[PDB]
Amino acid sequence: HHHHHEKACRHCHYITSEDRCPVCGSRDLSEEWFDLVIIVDVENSEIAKKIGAKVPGKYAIRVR
Ligand SMILES: [Zn+2]
């Protein structure tokens, strides 16, 4: 796993193994992040609503 301990975007918190965030495009990926959540269908996800995510995938609640 639920934590770092895949990098998390410092701007939108999406978790990726790519060299840039697919959601917002940022290169600001952190190795230090906590509390993984998974969103499969944004429109039908309570955790998406809670965190404001608009693209499905894995997100960290906390990113340093
Ligand atoms: Zn991002």
Question: How many residues comprise the chain?
Answer: 64
Q: How far is the CA of 9 from the centre of ligand 1 (A)?
A: 5
Determination technique for this PDB entry? X-ray
CA separation, residue 64 to residues 16, 19, 40, 44 (Å): 15, 17, 25, 28
- DSSP assignment letter at 12: T
Yes or no: domain 1-64 corresponds to CATH 2.60.260.40: no
Order the strands of the 7-9 sheet from edge to edge.
15-16, 7-9, 29-30
The distance of Cα 63 from the centroid of its chain, to the nearest Å, equals: 9
DSSP-derived pairing of the beta strands 7-9 and 15-16: antiparallel
What resolution in angstroms, rounded to 1 decimal?
1.4
Q: How far is the CA of 23 from the centre of ligand 1 (A)?
A: 5
| CA atoms in the 13 A half-sphere facing the CB of 35 | 7
Which H/E stretch holds residue 46?
helix 46-51
12 is in an annotated binding site: yes
Q: How far is the CA of 39 from the centre of ligand 1 (A)?
A: 15
- Domain locations in the chain? 1-64
Q: What is d(CA 36, CA 11) in angstroms, rounded to the nearest whole number? A: 16
